[PDB]
Amino acid sequence: SNAQEKVGTIGIAIPSATHGFMGGLNFHAQDTIKRLQEVYPQLDFVLATAGNAGKMVNDIEDMVATRNISALVVLPFESEPLTSPVQAVKEAGIWVTVVDRGLSVEGIEDLYVAGDNPGFGRVAGEYFAQHLESGKKIVVLRGIPTTLDNERVEAFTAAIEGSGIEVLDMQHGNWNRDDAFNVMQDFLSKYPQIDAVWAADDDMAIGAMEAIAQAGRTEEMWVMGGAGMKEIIRRIADGDPQLPANVTYPPAQISTAIELTALKLVSSTPVSGRFIIGSQLVTPENAEQFYFPDSPF
Amino acid sequence: AQEKVGTIGIAIPSATHGFMGGLNFHAQDTIKRLQEVYPQLDFVLATAGNAGKMVNDIEDMVATRNISALVVLPFESEPLTSPVQAVKEAGIWVTVVDRGLSVEGIEDLYVAGDNPGFGRVAGEYFAQHLESGKKIVVLRGIPTTLDNERVEAFTAAIEGSGIEVLDMQHGNWNRDDAFNVMQDFLSKYPQIDAVWAADDDMAIGAMEAIAQAGRTEEMWVMGGAGMKEIIRRIADGDPQLPANVTYPPAQISTAIELTALKLVSSTPVSGRFIIGSQLVTPENAEQFYFPDSPF
């Protein structure tokens, strides 16, 4: 008959976004908090979304000073500006889970959760090696030139080593639909036979698909994207042979981090350390599991 | 009353005492927690005294309990590999704990403790609490890859500290062998400022030797993995035990909790989770105190 005991308050600081990968992440964060409000009513949650680093820092300082958080789940807007702030959170005795982007100094956080970039590459590459015979021709769209893009591409390249697959070219589409369209338009102009495309990303794949359709070559090649936009997952689930498979890189990694942080507060389960969430092959057979009709991603 | 969404099987080595007995306790304790939190799950737990028996428990689980997921701590790597492959091939989620299979890529999720982590956190403590010129002795485990990992990381974390390592000898993660190694250390070295016992059972045997020699006041001891009696003394400020380093038998709990999340939510839980070793101090020790555990 007494008031509900609260065992702690989880703060969640993430980049604000209404569309794209980060939009889907915002959605999964909000969805997880709603699930956990029901499962663990002894927890409270604060969610602050920030359009730049300065505002995340101020959000975090306010969360500590006035909202008495006892755990922080932070996806750093940028590594360096968030490092002393998050060290101050740790100094105050607050649990810290870092998601996605590391801080500039090591060993601050209690728990680090992120996706698997070498994994993503390798799963994609294994799919190509297992479905294309020697001498088939592909093109690759890369992301923004980055360490992360390098990890995916190196793992993919290692996985098709010795398959005899001919990689006609690789160009950067910058995880952007329009750059991707432009790159694919050029690939189509230049290469009269292309058997498959590693678009490596779902936004990039939509751009690639339109360039292919304007070229009237939709039937000629399949396309592997990445990260699981609902509209692509929808089509894979419905057996669209232009999209025979995909690879996850879950924006719901944020849900993983929040769930684990809740376990820390409500149980004695060990959840410190490093969790690299695996990338998974999506096929028509398992696609429904990955369909979030309410997601803006 | 609750509709069931699926059954989780758990296959672990049997033990009523030691580290693995603590692990059995945590498995049961988590299952009990989850019967309250997620009544939509069922659980079947089976423990084995040898690899051959774990194989048959797992075939049987699949054959007659209709499990949706398996949490397995393999008894030995090689004999468990094909049977666990067969589980994955029947469409059942697989979480492997602690000991890997002999081929990569089978499990959906791998959960284990951090052996480099354990030695570095210990070594960091030594470096931060001992001045240049202080002298230690080290007890190692059984000659193993895992012991090599801990010792390499400890050594690395104390480099440049000036700590003299008087000797290091294998105590085989056993009380009696540790007693014998420490008796010898005490015979040879007239002043020892600290002992990296590196395991709580080894710590207990070392402390008996030190007490026999009348040198309890002389040196502090760091163990490992968090036996309740040691945790109790750290919480209570015993100056002989100023800190410890976790390497959790409750890793099994992390593995079961995550596997539960796979069946009750859309939370992504595949991949690789290396559970971090933490420093235990008097200030935090009560959180690692489990009075009902046999460990």
| Helix, strand or coil, per DSSP, at residue B225 | coil
Residues of chain A found within 8 Å of residue B288, distances taken between Cβ atoms:
268
- Resolution rounded to one decimal, in angstroms: 1.9
**Is the Cβ pair B276, A110 closer than 8 Å?**
yes
Q: Please tell me the distance in Å from A79's CA to the nearest CA on chain B.
A: 22
Residue length, chain B? 295
Q: A1-114+252-278, what's its fold?
A: Rossmann fold (3.40.50)
How far apart (Å, rounded) are the C-alpha atoms in residues A238 and A203? 19
Residues of chain A found within 8 Å of residue B250, distances taken between Cβ atoms:
268-270
**Is the Cβ pair A252, B272 closer than 8 Å?**
no
Sign of CA dihedral B12, B14, B20, B23: positive
**Is the Cβ pair A119, B274 closer than 8 Å?**
no
Among A30, A233, A268, A289, the strongest candidate for a mutation testing the B interface, having the largest count of B CBs within 10 A, is: A268
Pairing of strands A281-282, A246-247: antiparallel
Backbone torsions φ then ψ of B93, nearest 5 degrees: -60, 140
- The DSSP call for residue B93 is E
| Helix, strand or coil, per DSSP, at residue B281 | coil
Sign of CA dihedral B225, B231, B234, B238: negative
Q: Please tell me the distance in Å from A268's CA to the nearest CA on chain B.
A: 7
Residues of chain A found within 8 Å of residue B108, distances taken between Cβ atoms:
278
Sequence-distant (6+) residues with CB within 8 A of B153 are B115, B116, B117, B118, B119, B120, B123
Which of B33, B250, B266 lies closest to A252 in CB terms? Answer: B266
> A-contacting residues of B 118-137, CB under 8 Å?
none
How far apart (Å, rounded) are the C-alpha atoms in residues B200 and B194? 15
Helix H, strand E, coil C: the string for A160-201 is HCCCCCEEEEEEECCCCHHHHHHHHHHHHHHCCCCCEEECCC
Supply A158's token pair: 């290692």
- CA B269 vs. chain centroid, Å, equals 21
Strands (E), B73-203: 93-97, 109-113, 135-140, 164-170, 194-196
How far apart (Å, rounded) are the C-alpha atoms in residues B31 and B54? 19
DSSP-assigned states of every residue in chain A: -PPPP--EEEEEEEE--SSHHHHHHHHHHHHHHHHHHHH-TTEEEEEEEESSHHHHHHHHHHHHHHH--SEEEE--SSTTTTHHHHHHHHHTT-EEEEESS--SSSS--SEEEEE-HHHHHHHHHHHHHHH--TT-EEEEEE-SSSHHHHHHHHHHHHHHTTS--EEEEEEE-TT-HHHHHHHHHHHHHH-S---EEE--SHHHHHHHHHHHHHTT-TTT-EEE--S--HHHHHHHHTT-TT---EE---TTHHHHHHHHHHHHHHS-----EEEEEPP-EE-TTTGGGG--TT---
Question: How many Å is the maximal CA-CA distance in chain A?
Answer: 75
Whether the CB of B117 is below 8 Å from some CB of chain A: the reply is yes
Residues of chain A found within 8 Å of residue B278, distances taken between Cβ atoms:
272
Q: Which H/E stretch holds residue B211?
A: helix B200-212
**Is the Cβ pair A32, B267 closer than 8 Å?**
yes
Chains A, B: CB pairs < 8 Å: 79
Residues of chain B found within 8 Å of residue A252, distances taken between Cβ atoms:
266-268
CATH annotation of A116-251+279-297: 3.40.50.2300
- The DSSP call for residue B288 is G
How far apart (Å, rounded) are the C-alpha atoms in residues B4 and B18? 34
Residues of chain B found within 8 Å of residue A275, distances taken between Cβ atoms:
271-274
Sequence-distant (6+) residues with CB within 8 A of A77 are A15, A50, A52, A53, A56
Residues of chain B found within 8 Å of residue A274, distances taken between Cβ atoms:
273-274, 276
Residues A286/A228, Cβ–Cβ less than 8 Å: no
Supply B144's token pair: 């193993």
Residues B244/B223, Cβ–Cβ less than 8 Å: yes
Looking at chain A, the domain(s) classified CATH 3.40.50.2300 span 1-114+252-278, 116-251+279-297
Query: Which residue shows structure tokens 């959906």?
Result: B108
Which of B108, B275, B288 lies closest to A273 in CB terms? Answer: B275
Query: Which residue shows structure tokens 């490092």?
Result: A83
Pairing of strands B244-245, A95-99: unpaired
Supply A40's token pair: 């663990």
Q: Which residue of B has its CA nearest to A259?
A: B267
Whether the CB of A52 is below 8 Å from some CB of chain B: the reply is no
How far apart (Å, rounded) are the C-alpha atoms in residues A187 and A207? 13
Instruction: Decide yes or no: CATH 3.40.50.2300 for domain B1-112+250-276.
Output: yes
Among residues A126, A251, A135, the alpha carbon closest in space to that of A198 is found at A126
Q: Which experimental method was this entry solved with?
A: X-ray
Q: Please tell me the distance in Å from B266's CA to the nearest CA on chain A.
A: 8
Whether the CB of B246 is below 8 Å from some CB of chain A: the reply is yes
Residue type, A77: F
Residues of chain A found within 8 Å of residue B270, distances taken between Cβ atoms:
277-278, 280
Torsion from C-alpha of A125, A131, A135, A139, nearest 10 degrees: -50
**Is the Cβ pair A292, B266 closer than 8 Å?**
yes
Whether the CB of B261 is below 8 Å from some CB of chain A: the reply is yes
Query: Under the phi-then-psi rule, with left for phi > 0, alpha for psi from -120 to 50, and beta for the rest, what region is B41?
Result: beta
Sequence-distant (6+) residues with CB within 8 A of B294 are B16, B17, B21, B22, B24, B25
| Helix, strand or coil, per DSSP, at residue B279 | strand
Residues A86/A247, Cβ–Cβ less than 8 Å: no
Q: Which residue of A has its CA nearest to B254?
A: A269
Q: B114-249+277-295, what's its fold?
A: Rossmann fold (3.40.50)
Q: Please tell me the distance in Å from A270's CA to the nearest CA on chain B.
A: 6
Q: Which residue of B has its CA nearest to A120?
A: B271
Note every long-range contact of A90-93, with CB atoms under 8 Å and residues 24 or more positions apart, other chains counting: A92/A64
Helix H, strand E, coil C: the string for B112-145 is EECHHHHHHHHHHHHHHHCCCCCEEEEEECCCCH
Whether the CB of B253 is below 8 Å from some CB of chain A: the reply is yes
Which of A35, A253, A292 lies closest to B265 in CB terms? Answer: A35
Q: Please tell me the distance in Å from A106's CA to the nearest CA on chain B.
A: 13
Whether the CB of B115 is below 8 Å from some CB of chain A: the reply is no
Q: Please tell me the distance in Å from A271's CA to the nearest CA on chain B.
A: 6
Whether the CB of B254 is below 8 Å from some CB of chain A: the reply is yes
Burial profile A24-42: b = 16 or more Cβ within 10 angstroms, e = fewer: bbbbbbebbbebbeeebee
**Is the Cβ pair A256, B265 closer than 8 Å?**
no
Among residues B146, B113, B70, B48, the alpha carbon closest in space to that of B254 is found at B113
**Is the Cβ pair B270, A292 closer than 8 Å?**
no
Whether the CB of A273 is below 8 Å from some CB of chain B: the reply is yes
Looking at chain B, the domain(s) classified CATH 3.40.50.2300 span 1-112+250-276, 114-249+277-295
